[PDB]
């Protein structure tokens, strides 16, 4: 088998700035596994219906995992923008793949607020598809430059999110992967 | 000579369920994903819903998801949707359609449809 | 979410005309669209799948054109029986899947 187990009920996944990938290849991708979880608050597939996935063969299968706040998962997708969209994760215009979500307050909240899970809330510039940016330069947001020094326009590039148990339906944590596909093969379900 | 079927309209009041049926015939309705598309009255096409070749997969539009859910039944070739918590604003014909060998959904036969009249 | 918007949504032609439907998809769709046929009280009927390649039954003098976020319908020579209500379909996004709002095509006099 593919190790999907591994990627979706794994007990910590990253902070959206620093998102994880795992390749997958030379093995058996079972679907059934996911589609039987009515647990699974999104599950959209570009270039494929996802009825048709135990029936296919994948190239260069990847699978990447991070947590968001609900009413930030509709950036993940071909052709958004916002925070997330521009500054953390950027799927590309021509995405074949699938974009699985679910609500995590039950682990990822923390009584009085977990503030572990992180984002970059300002960048120079708009990632490219599928970039990893980790750096913590502070940002030039002013017309003087900053010299590594926090201030008044020179800001921490990353922030964190506040998830509280009490947060509203769309501001609770939603963990995501995305299985980025390609249609020799090593990835094929029954 | 494909052939689809619809059964079970008419007129359902504002909260009430009501539970739609297909019956299809001519080509081997054991492989081929079903889908709903529905058509407001005097406007245009919205997907509902499709099931799989088999029933292990179904998915919504996410206008319709957690209120109607689909099924199928292979020995019957007829096909199910069943609404439930209906909105006056869901008022149309609904069909069912035969998806058509590719990967992504296409609409290959459609079949007549069903009025459905949601008003107390 | 993906909107798909076609040009014009009013089409007068006479028959032995040119006639060119135009779809546009809010984002690159690549080639995952479809066309249809749908008359008065009818159901709709497929025409043109995968941008470009053509239903089996559909008279040759159908053809769709282009990829991306720009797609065209063209019936080369109208003939009468034509006269109806013409929708695309993008199938990318598949849990999430939309229709053109229609262009009609009447007979001009």
């Known amino acids: 088998l593919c190790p999907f187990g591994e990627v979706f009920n794994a007990t910590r996944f990253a902070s959206v700035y620093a998102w994880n990938r795992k390749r997958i290849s030379n093995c058996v991708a079972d679907y059934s596994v996911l589609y039987n979880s009515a647990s699974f608050s999104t599950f959209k597939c570009y270039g494929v219906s996802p009825t048709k996935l135990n029936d296919l063969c994948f190239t260069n299968v990847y699978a990447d995992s991070f947590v968001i706040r609900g009413d930030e998962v509709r950036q993940i997708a071909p052709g958004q923008t916002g925070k997330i969209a521009d500054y953390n994760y950027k799927l590309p215009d021509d995405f074949t793949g699938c974009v699985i979500a679910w609500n995590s307050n039950n682990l990822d909240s923390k009584v009085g607020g977990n503030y572990n899970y992180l984002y970059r809330l300002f960048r120079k510039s708009n990632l490219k598809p599928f970039e990893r940016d980790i750096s913590t330069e502070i940002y030039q947001a002013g017309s003087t430059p900053c010299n590594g020094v926090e201030g008044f326009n020179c800001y921490f590039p990353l922030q964190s999110y506040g998830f509280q148990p009490t947060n509203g339906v769309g501001y609770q944590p939603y963990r995501v992967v995305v299985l980025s596909f390609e249609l020799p093969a090593t990835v094929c379900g029954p | 000579q494909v052939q689809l079927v619809e059964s079970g309209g008419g007129v359902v009041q504002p909260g009430r369920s009501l539970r739609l049926s297909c019956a299809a015939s001519g080509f081997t309705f054991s492989s081929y994903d079903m889908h709903w598309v529905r058509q407001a009255p005097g406007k245009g096409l919205e997907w509902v819903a499709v099931?799989?070749?088999?029933?292990?997969?179904?998915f919504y539009a996410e206008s319709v998801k957690g209120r109607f859910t689909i099924s199928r039944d292979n020995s019957k070739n007829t096909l199910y949707l069943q609404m439930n918590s209906l909105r006056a604003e869901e008022t149309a014909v609904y069909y069912c359609?035969?998806?058509?060998?590719?990967?992504?959904?296409?609409?290959?036969?459609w079949g007549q449809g069903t009025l459905v009249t949601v008003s107390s | 979410d993906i909107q798909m918007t076609q040009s014009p949504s009013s089409l007068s032609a006479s028959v032995g005309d040119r006639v060119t439907i135009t779809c546009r998809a809010s984002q690159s769709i690549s080639s995952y669209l479809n066309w249809y046929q749908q008359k008065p009280g009818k159901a709709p009927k497929l025409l043109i799948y995968?941008?470009?390649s053509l239903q089996s039954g559909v008279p040759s003098r159908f053809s769709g054109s282009g990829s991306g976020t720009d797609f065209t319908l063209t019936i080369s020579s109208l003939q009468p029986e034509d006269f109806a209500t013409y929708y695309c379909?993008?199938?990318?996004?598949?849990?999430?899947?939309?229709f053109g709002p229609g262009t009609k095509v009447d007979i001009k006099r």
């Open positions: 099931i799989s070749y088999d029933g292990s997969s179904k």
């Open positions: 359609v035969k998806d058509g060998e590719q990967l992504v959904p296409l609409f290959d036969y």
């Open positions: 379909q993008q199938s990318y996004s598949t849990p999430g899947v939309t």
């Open positions: 995968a941008a470009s």
